[PDB]
Structure formats: C-alpha cells, structure tokens
Design a protein around this ligand. Structure first.
Ligand SMILES: CC(=O)N[C@@H]1[C@@H](O)[C@H](O)[C@@H](CO)O[C@H]1O
Ligand SMILES: *[C@@H]1O[C@H](CO)[C@@H](O)[C@H](O)[C@H]1NC(C)=O
Ligand SMILES: *[C@@H]1O[C@H](CO)[C@@H](O)[C@H](O)[C@H]1NC(C)=O
Ligand SMILES: *[C@@H]1O[C@H](CO)[C@@H](O)[C@H](O)[C@H]1NC(C)=O
Ligand SMILES: *[C@@H]1O[C@H](CO)[C@@H](O)[C@H](O)[C@H]1NC(C)=O
Ligand SMILES: *[C@@H]1O[C@H](CO)[C@@H](O)[C@H](O)[C@H]1NC(C)=O
Ligand SMILES: *[C@@H]1O[C@H](CO)[C@@H](O)[C@H](O)[C@H]1NC(C)=O
Ligand SMILES: *[C@@H]1O[C@H](CO)[C@@H](O)[C@H](O)[C@H]1NC(C)=O
Ligand SMILES: *[C@@H]1O[C@H](CO)[C@@H](O)[C@H](O)[C@H]1NC(C)=O
Lengths: 171, 316, 316, 171, 316, 171
C-alpha cells in the first residue's frame, strides 16, 4: 500500500528470512540462497524505535482527588465533576484511537517505502545489464557468481565490467 | 541467473487498525492501553501514613481513633473506609475542602493557643468518646457552665498566629437533645457564638432538638474552621454551647492523599494510585480506573489499541 | 501505436481544505458537521412523560398541576417553560440538585410515612392551591395550632426507610406575612424546627416578614430535602411553622431528562436532544446547539467541514 | 502532488471516463478508445470507504444537563460550567478542523499514489518494447491491435512475443 | 558530459522533532510557542477604567476610594491589588459572583430608589469612612433608631424595577460589637431583617459580638445582593441593624475585566491579558501564564516547539 | 527519508546553491556551473506557506476570569477550577507537541518528494539518450553545450535530435 512494493509488485513475503526485514534471494550457477540487508532493516527498526520512545512516555503532571469514594460530595458539584471528567475521557479516547491509527498508517507505509528504496537502489547499480522481471527480481542477462552476488549486496558492483557481455546477451 | 528482493513475514500476524482499514495483519505489534492492576499501595521509598480507623479530619480534633495521628508527617496519606472523624456524633461544616487541604499538607504540626478560663468548667467528657472510661476530643475542650443551670459568663478569647505559615483554626457548636438540657449544660437563654478574624466574619446559634441515637447519643456537635493567615488574630465571642480549640494546627509541606482498600507494600514503587491499588506502567493510556490519581496514564474508554511495530504481514 | 493512462474528472468540483492549501477542487466530498435540526422531540419507542404545566419538583410535593404525575414512570422526562413547582409561593432549597436527581430517576414511587398527630390541626388549605375550592400540596400537610393563638405542642416524629433503595424526604418551613399572623397560626414564641437523619444534621427557624404578593399571597414556603439511605431514620423535632411530609418518594430506575419547546413525535427515533428539537445524524460533529444532551455528535464552532471522498479534480 | 502523477506528469484528467477512476486510452490500428481499470479504482474507493466508516460513527457516551435554560443556576457555578464547556468546544473545533485537513491530505495523495502504481505496473509489463512518452502514455514501438490492448489491460501481455518486433523498430 | 541535480543546504541547521526522530537538522525553522511577555496593559483604542484603590464591589456601595467610579463606563476594567471594597470593615456575601457580573458589565448606571423614612435617623457616619470627617458609604444609608435605645419602628419599603434591564440591589446588615450597643443603635430585642422579591426569598438576623479591630473598628457590615429582573418588586421588611440601598445599579453593556500589577499603555494593541502584562503574538500556543484571559494562544507546558519551514539540512 | 532522494541516493546537498531549494549542476564543454529550478522550489515554499497560514492563526473565542489572584475563591470550587484547567493544559500540550511532530514529518518528506519528482522529470526528457549515474546525475552520452543545457532546465529539450548520436556512443 501507497509505495507499491509490499502487498504490491512483490507478491507475498518470505517466512524463510530470519536475520532481518528485507533481503536478497538469488538463483545463479551455485543455486538458490538468501541473505538479509542490514542497512535497510536498521533504517526501518530505528524509525519504529523513534515512535516508541515518543509514546511509551511519562506524564509528570500530578492530579489529585476532587471527589470522594467514601462520603459522596454534594450532588451539584458532584454532577459538574462527573460531567467534566466524562468530557475529558471523551477527548483522550478520541486522541488515543486516532493516534494509534495515524501511526499505524505511517508505520505500514514507512516499511513499504523502505523496500522500493531498496529495489530502485540496485536497479541503479545494475545500469542496463539487467531488466525488471516485474515481480521484484532482476533478470541478470550475464553470469554472476557467489562473489559477484555479494558484490551487489554490499554495493561494490561495477557495471562497466559486464556491460560488454550483457549488451549482446540481450539480443 | 537472476536476483530477487523480498521482505520477511510470519505464520501468525497481529491484527491492528489504521486510517483506512480494520484488522490488517502486521508482523509485530505492542499494546498501548494498560489493563493490569497491581492490588497494593506500592509505597516503596515514601513516608506513608495509613490512617486506618482514624478519619483525616479527626487528626485536628482528636477522637480516640486519632491519638497517634495528631502530629503526623508524610509524603503519602491513605484514607480507609473504616475511618471515622468523630467520637461524639456530628460532622464538619464545609468538610471536603478541609479534607483536600489536609490530603496535600504533608502532615500537621500542632501549637497550643493556651486559652485560659475563668468562671466555668473546662472538662466535660462522654461515654461515646472512650479512653480511660468517659473522655472527649483530645484537641478540644467541652466548655460547660460551672454548675447545673448556672450562668455562662459571656466570654471572649483571642489567638494570634505568631508563625510564618497559615493556621487551621477549628471550633465546635453543641446541639443539645432538648432546650431543657441546653439549659442544664450552659444555662438558659438565647445562646450566640460569634466568630471573626479580620478577613472572615460569621456567627452561630445552637439548635437543640431530638435526633436519633448514634454512638448511643442523640445530640450533635458540628465543627467549623477557618484558615488564619500569618500575623492575624481570631476572636471567639461566645456565651456557651461552644467546643473550644485547645491547639491550632499548621501544615508541614506537600503530600499526596488517596483513598484505598488494599494493603501497603514497600516492595514496589508507583506514582499512579486508585482505591484498588497501583497502576505501574510506561504506557500512555489506561483502562483501569478513571479516578486514578497521582502521575497516571490517561484514562480511555477502549480496553485495547494495538500499535504496529512491524510491516504488513503478507504470507502465501 | 500507443497507450495512455489517465484519471477521471468533472466540470464541478467540490472545494475542500488540506494541510497545505485552502480550497483545492476534489471530485466528490461529503459534509462532516450536522446543521439540520428536526424540530420535534423524537420519542419513538421510549416511555415518555411530558410534564407540561407540572414542574419536576412538583412531583414530590403535589400542587394541583402535578396531580397526574405523583407516581410517574419514564425513560424520558420532558420539562416545559410553563411548568411550575408550586401553588403557594415559595422555593426549594438546593433546588437544581433535586432536579438532576429526578431527571435521571426513571420516575418516582410514593410510600406513606403515616405520621399521626395529637393536639393540633392537620388540614390548612389556601386560595392559591385550588382543587375543589381551597386546597394544599397533595403530598404535604399544613400543620397548624388547634385554634387561633393556641399552643403548638413541641413534637417529634420519626420515619425509618424500611426499603432497599434510598428515599427522598421533603419538609417545608412557612414564613408568615407578619409575626402577628405567625402567632395566629402556630402560637407565640421563637419557632425552632430541627431535623436530622444520622448522616445529616441541620435546623431551621421561620422568618416572618412582608414580601410582595405572588398568587395573591404575601407569604412563602421554602422546602427542604435529604436523601434517607436504606435502614436509617430521620427525626423531625419542631414547634410550628412546619409543612410536614405525608409520603416519601423513591426512585424507580434510569431516565434521561430534557427541557424543550417543541412537540413529542412517536414517528421518529433519536437520542440527541436540545430545547428546539432532536439531532438525527450519523455525523461526528454538529453546529446546532452546544448544550444538546443525550448521545450526540460533538459540538464544534465551524458551520461546515468538507471531507474529500475523491481525487483532485483536474479539468482542462 | 507528492507522488508526481495526478496534476503532475499526467496534467489534467478525462471528463470522458465514467465507469471508474483510473483508465486506459489507446490509439492503435482501429483507432482511439477508452476503458476503466477496475482494480485500481476499487483499491482507491475501498480505502476511502475505510475512512468514512471510521468517522461516520456514533459515540455511546451519554451526557446530561448540568445547566438550566428556564431557571438559571447560581452564577458562580454557572460561570464555571460555561468556562468548562467553552474550553472543550475549543478542543473539538480544533480536533475536527485538523482531522478533516489531515484526512484530506491523505485522501488526495492516496489517489495520486494509486496511479503511479498503475503507471509503473505497465512500464514493467512492456519491459523494453516501449518507452516513456513523458506525459503518461507509452509509445509502443511495434503494432498492437484491440486484442493486444486488452492483453495489457488484463495483465496477460507477454513481451518476448514482440521483443523481436520492438527492438528493430526502435532503430 | 553529465548533468547533476541537487538541493541546497547550510552550515548552521536548526534542530526539530518529528514523529520518528529527536533533533533532526532542517534548513530553517520557526518557533510555535510564545515566551515573550510585554509588561504593560497594552490598552490602545479601548475605553479603559483602572480602579486603582477602588475595589470593584465598592462601585456599588460607594466608599471614599470609589467616589469617582460610581457610574463608570468601560470596555476594559482593571483591578489592582491595592483596591478595597470597603471603608467600615466588612464583606460581601457571595462576593465573587458579583465581581464576575461587574467585570463584564461594561460599567454601571445608578438610579435612585427614593426610599423615604418616618420615625428614625437616616444619617449615621463613622471615622473609618472619611470624606469631610466622619462619613459613610455613598450609595447607602446607616438607618438608626431616633435616639439612643429608642424603638426601631418595624418597617417595610419596596422598589420596583421600571427599566428594561435587570438591576443589582444591595443591602447591608450591621453586626454591633456588643449586645449593649446593638441596643444603643437600634433599640432592644431580636432584630429580624427579611428580604424577598417574588422569585427570591431569604432573611437575616444580626450577630453582635467581639472581633478584632480593622480600620479602628471592631464591628462589621456584611452586604447582600440579588438581581431584580424587569417589572418585578423587591420588598425590605426590617426592624433595625439594616444598611439600606439609596440607589440601584444597572448594567451598561459588555466589557472585559482583568487583574493586573503593571501600567496601562495606550501605545500598543492587545487582546490577551494576564496580571504581569499582555501577550502580543500570532503564535498558536504560549508558555507565559495559564490564567491569561481575553483572546489568547493556548497555554502549553513546553517552553519551545520548533516547526520546520525547510528541508533536511545535509552537509558534507 | 521515505522518497529516497534527500539523504538518499543524492548524498549531501549544495551550500553553493542560494537562488532556490533545488537545482542543476552541469559539467560540459565549457565547464561546471549551477542554476536553480524555480518551479519545484516554488511548489515546496508554497506548500510550506500553506501550513504556516493554517497554524499562525488567532482564536476569536474570549475566556474570562473564573478565579481570583488577590482574594482566593473558596477552596472546593478553587480545586475544581484548578483540576479542570490542569486537565485542559494536558490536552493542549499533547495536541501541540503532536501537531508539530506530525507536520514536521510531512514537511521533510514533502521536500524529499519534490526532488524525486524533479529527478524522474528529466529522466523522462532524456528518454534513452542518458542513463542513471546512481548518485543523482545523468551521464549524457552525447554532446550538450550551454544552450543544450538550458534546453533541459526549461523543458524544451527534444531527444530525437541526439537520439542518433547517443545510441552508438553508448556502444
Ligand atoms: C457521484 C458520487 O460519487 N457521489 C458521492 C456519493 O455517492 C457518496 O455517498 C458521498 C459520500 O461518500 O459523496 C459523494
Ligand atoms: C459520578 O461518577 C461516579 C463513578 O465515576 C459515581 O460513583 C457517582 O455516583 C457519580 N456521581 C453521582 C452524584 O452519583
Ligand atoms: C515486538 O514488539 C515489541 C515492541 O516493539 C518488542 O519489545 C518485541 O521484542 C518485538 N518482538 C519481535 C519479535 O520483534
Ligand atoms: C509579622 O509581625 C512581625 C512584627 O513583630 C514582623 O517581624 C513580621 O515581618 C511580620 N510579617 C510576617 C509575614 O510574619
Ligand atoms: C436492613 O435491616 C434489616 C433488619 O431487619 C436487614 O435484614 C437488612 O439486611 C438490612 N439491610 C438492608 C440493605 O436492607
Ligand atoms: C452560559 O451559556 C449559556 C448558553 O451559551 C447562556 O445562555 C448563559 O447566559 C451563560 N451564562 C450566564 C451566567 O449567563
Ligand atoms: C525562515 O522561516 C521564517 C518563517 O517561515 C521566515 O520568516 C524566514 O524568512 C525564513 N528564512 C529563510 C532563510 O528561509
Ligand atoms: C413591563 O411593565 C409595563 C407595564 O406598564 C409594560 O409596558 C411592559 O410591556 C412590561 N413588560 C416588560 C417585559 O417590560
Ligand atoms: C490553583 O492554582 C493557582 C496557581 O495556578 C494557585 O495559586 C492556587 O493556590 C491553586 N488553588 C488552590 C485552592 O490552592
């Protein structure tokens, strides 16, 4: 939702991956494998962490009794106190449910944002020595081994090296 | 040969609510509203006074319940349902204001007003107020006429407040079961108690009459009070039916007063109290008690509101 | 050959407000603040009592207006401007607290206190309170001395609340036009009415004097009341100038009380009421009446706040 | 605004299209025509529908009279009641005007998001057999008939069939 | 050959807070909470009355302090700590309601009630209330018995409100230092003052007694008041110990009342006032005074809350 | 953050640029230079300006004294007034701190949004006569002189002009 990635063009996610939130699954010569991108995972977690420190927070404003549970106060002032407290309860119940919905919209769409940032950071590494498969992988039209893979995953990969190979592999 | 991108998921999502949808699965969530009470007055580190059977307002008048609370000192004052302000039956005029002053006083410190008395008795007791047998309010004095039916010499007495803090002055008015026994106690005639202290003027007359028995007594004492400010005098103008202040009380500091039915416990720290215990929680909101006092999460109507701490959970 | 993507639009957008600009055209919008009143007390499905000319507090004392309302029963109580609590002129002491109790009572159920009387008359009527000629408050008793100037034997009467719910006790105090006619009604002398439950002590003296005529009457009765809790007694000690309670009132349940100037209508359902009608609406907010009661949209100051239900309208 | 599509690179929209919110206009052999994309339209509407169910909602909290329109209450407590009611009125007028502005920002930018998601779902189907015109069309550099069109609109279109065909048309 | 895109930045960012981070550098920011007081009653363009030593309630009774304020007219009323309602010592019953009426009245306009008097004195002065020697409240009349100990003929007097606005009626009750000089002033006997309109009934008795001296005086006057509505009468039945209203007060319009300790200044315009000055600001919130009145930014606890007006500042 | 541009694939910004917020730096035959895009700068500023007019605003609701600084009111009603005022203060302090955080999130991410709209706005002009550098410039694989530069900056640039040239310069 909203950035098109999660529950979008990358249909369903990976119960497999356990070292992080976002990750690479490759299929090359040596076979299939997976590995988690720590850098996008950390940017998500610590943004979520920011939200929790803002809300799991302490009022230091003290309130006292204006009321009495044992010997009821005079009923006119009693009804004004209850009327006021009920009105304030309405405000905070509204604030709370709106706060949680608002930050939930932002949390979900913030995670969706962090992978489209991941998708299009490598689409930019691999220049046009690949194309988009459409469902969130990259068709590498040249050969890339387990050392060329970690080349992408850690942002070293040069595309000029395999530009030659790839340009006519694609025709 | 190709490379895929993806995101994690799980077999067991937690459902949450958003601006646009109800019950969306997310990877992980955490609760925002506190539901867990802890059923004790978590009082660790605080000077605590549990009044038990003494009523808060008894601390200034001194019925037997309150003998060890006449000069207490506390950060946290605890009121109990079994507490009683009174030995001879009666009540305080403008009573809940006095309680709210006392709850936040950090305790009281007494000082004599040293009133002396010529031409009356000073020492009326009663079976309702039992110490060694028949006694009376510790901080006050049942002012009687010399002998049965004798005159009550119309008197005046003053007390100035020497100290730099304001004082709580309190007196009584006795309502005798009959006009007959109003006469046996303080002689005949219209009996006017009047009271003024600079920024306060008021006045009182008894009203003898039949009322049903409470602590075996059909009479009533109602108590009055005023805050006497530094370097001001209070004058007590009267002719009988006047329960007189022996000592004036002064406030010590700041405190927090609560009403509770659970046990004190010095093993836990808390700052949010209600009558069924203590709300210990970092959470912003709570659904336990709307009249919780202290430093509390905000009371909300909802029992639960889950806050997402992970992405959408999309499985296969 | 080519393919284009696009989005719909229209010739007449609705302008709305956003975080960054005022009046951006969107396709379709819907209103969020209710402005439409419906000028009737939408009472469908609810046991309704319209008091008309009876005042709410008349239900406890019983002036002729309130003869059909001495034991009513309702989910919804309606108060009218033409209503009056009184036949002989007077007041309720602490009157709006009593109204707030009665509004939410779901009606009242009367029970006799069966007071009997030796040595006085029991039966004073007057021209202000007309049934068949001169009558009086239905639920009360004008307690007079035997014959003009005769003694008022100083009496006591008690009523205990047998019953499992709390009771509304009410008495009166008569203020005669003169001290002269205070004497013709209840003999000479200082007139002391005293009253106490156990949980309540207070006391009263009449104040004869001249005040201008109301319902042809220059005298006044002010009424007093107390809530008698289950298994406690109230004792009435008095020597004249005393309007006495025939029956005690008990509360039936829960109700909603309103004040209105419009007609009842059993054809429409509503839960949000004000004096000019009913607010029927799903909308979260309303701009009709800030003192609307019941279950209401929140009152806001703005007359309109449009919520977008479509995209930007971009035409050519 | 914010996702660049509506009132952005697709400047102005189609009073023509009336079966939905988002749609395709093609111009091929047989000519011009239009047809509405039901899934993106539904994803928009149903999100807006979520918002309306959240706000067109009923408090069950009952409030009673503490006031009196016929016999005014005593003036000190009267002034405290009015002071309190006025303060809460300020809160709800603030909450209301902020709520509506906040959800209007999100609604507008939510519709713009659902089209950039539409654009780039098609740019990924048409792989390298088209290019971006710049103003929100795709120049198909090969021939596409009314069955080739509904191929795209229904997410069937294979690009390898016309890959041969597009690659020599583009030089 | 290439083309690069970028965005501006600076060496000196302002830190702000977001939903996800504390203290992120942005290019430019502006503060949202007002901290700057301006220490004067910026009163430009407004009819201002600074009461100085006159107390607000003195405007109704007329002690010497208030001689030039008995008929004031204002948009803005200013109360001073040095102000006093009183010359002979005493107090107003239900006093802060009257102040709140007067603060928003836009001033008062007096009208005589023209009471005439047979058989008493009309003219008692005192050394506390000094104009040319011993005087008295300008708007009131110390009603005495003819000669020392003489009878106070029990009287009645009425005033109807001719005008189309409601009137503020005020009377006094004198509490003599002793029962002896209650007699020297108004003869012997129980002294009963009663007062009623048609929709208001109440009554009063003096309470002689000793209280400490204030302005050299050990006696007290407490004042009472009621709002008499158009076309109704108020009747004063009394037999002594009665300070009588010469003139009734009427309300002019609307005003704003404040309490302050700083100077008036006609050089600045403002609408948000507190006792230490004026809050001049476009900002939505303020952290200066929680009891600021007028049209004010909302008080918040935070001293600062910066709102970003630029992008992230990213330098090298 | 969130749109990947500022503090993303465009590492750090330009203390140099001072006529606006967003801008072009070119390196061509004659050399380096910079110039600011007024139109994206204006849409940013004018959105930020909208926020300020909404918040730098005055309530016209008047509040009066219910309290007294010189002669304290009776203590029961005094404690209800203070209890009420304190509760309302808690609401406004919460509203204020949430308002500023919420609009700060939106301001920062709307500025990042206005650049990704800028980026993918020229990538659409330069069609296939350039490719992504990765770090926020376009490698122009053909000649562009100081009049071909202002060709892009003011949105006239035709790509068919140098399409011929560029296609084989890229091989
Ligand atoms: C043409 C159209 O869509 N009109 C809609 C209407 O259907 C809808 O009920 C209302 C509230 O959502 O907004 C408008
Ligand atoms: C006010 O509410 C409390 C519970 O919050 C209730 O026990 C009390 O009865 C209410 N007030 C009155 C006057 O009944
Ligand atoms: C779930 O969320 C809470 C709060 O963010 C955290 O304490 C807990 O460790 C989380 N668990 C996992 C598996 O993320
Ligand atoms: C009280 O009275 C004494 C006079 O003996 C003086 O020293 C003191 O400053 C006065 N003021 C206060 C506030 O105590
Ligand atoms: C009241 O008194 C009777 C005594 O006969 C007793 O049975 C009953 O339990 C008491 N309590 C209540 C609530 O009625
Ligand atoms: C309080 O507000 C009500 C309705 O807004 C108004 O009718 C009333 O006059 C106000 N209070 C007083 C004391 O007038
Ligand atoms: C910074 O922001 C304030 C308020 O928006 C504005 O008045 C000022 O001109 C701004 N300065 C710059 C350099 O943007
Ligand atoms: C007041 O009294 C006079 C009676 O002569 C009358 O003209 C006027 O209409 C009355 N009513 C009001 C509301 O003033
Ligand atoms: C209410 O708060 C004010 C300060 O805001 C304080 O001066 C006053 O004493 C408080 N009220 C009471 C009854 O203490």
């Amino acid at each position: 939702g909203i950035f098109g990635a999660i529950a979008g063009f990358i249909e369903n996610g990976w119960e497999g991956l356990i070292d992080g939130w976002y990750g690479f699954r490759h299929q090359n010569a040596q076979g299939e494998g997976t590995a988690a991108d720590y850098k996008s995972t950390q940017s998500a977690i610590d943004q979520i962490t920011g939200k929790l420190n803002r809300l799991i927070a302490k009022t230091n404003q003290q309130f006292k009794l204006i009321d009495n549970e044992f010997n009821e106060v005079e009923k006119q002032i009693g009804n004004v106190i209850n009327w006021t407290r009920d009105s304030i309860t309405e405000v905070w119940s509204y604030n709370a449910e709106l706060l949680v919905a608002m930050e939930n919209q932002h949390t979900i769409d913030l995670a969706d944002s962090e992978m489209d940032k991941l998708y299009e950071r490598v689409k930019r590494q691999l220049r046009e020595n690949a194309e988009e498969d459409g469902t969130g992988c990259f068709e590498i039209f040249h050969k890339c081994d387990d050392d060329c893979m970690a080349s992408i995953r850690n942002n070293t990969y040069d595309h000029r090296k395999y530009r030659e190979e790839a340009m006519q592999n694609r025709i | 040969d190709k490379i895929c991108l993806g995101h994690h998921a799980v077999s067991n999502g937690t459902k949450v609510n958003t601006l646009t949808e109800r019950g969306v699965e997310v990877v992980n969530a955490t609760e925002t509203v506190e539901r867990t009470n802890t059923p004790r007055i978590c009082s660790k580190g605080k000077r605590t006074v549990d009044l038990g059977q003494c009523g808060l307002l008894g601390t200034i008048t001194g019925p037997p319940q309150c003998d060890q609370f006449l000069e207490f000192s506390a950060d946290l004052i605890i009121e109990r349902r079994e507490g009683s302000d009174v030995c001879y039956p009666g009540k305080f005029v403008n009573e809940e204001a006095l309680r709210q002053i006392l709850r936040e006083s950090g305790g009281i410190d007494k000082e004599p007003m040293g009133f002396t008395y010529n031409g009356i008795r000073t020492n009326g007791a009663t079976s309702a107020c039992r110490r060694s047998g028949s006694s009376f309010y510790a901080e006050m004095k049942w002012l009687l006429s010399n002998t049965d039916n004798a005159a009550f010499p119309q008197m005046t007495k003053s007390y100035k407040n020497t100290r730099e803090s304001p004082a709580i002055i309190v007196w009584g008015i006795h309502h005798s079961v009959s006009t007959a026994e109003q006469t046996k106690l303080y002689g005949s005639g219209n009996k006017l108690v009047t009271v003024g202290s600079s920024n306060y003027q008021q006045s009182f007359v008894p009203s003898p009459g039949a009322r049903p028995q409470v602590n075996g007594q059909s009479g009533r004492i109602d108590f009055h009070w005023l805050i006497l400010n530094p370097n001001d005098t209070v004058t007590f103008s009267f002719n009988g039916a006047f329960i007189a202040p022996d000592r004036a009380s002064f406030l010590r500091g700041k405190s927090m007063g609560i009403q509770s039915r659970v046990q004190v416990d010095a093993n836990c720290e808390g700052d949010c109290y209600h009558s069924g215990g203590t709300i210990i929680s970092n959470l912003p909101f709570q659904n336990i008690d709307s009249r919780a006092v202290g430093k509390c999460p905000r009371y909300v109507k909802q029992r639960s509101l889950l806050l997402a701490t992970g992405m959408k959970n999309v499985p296969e």
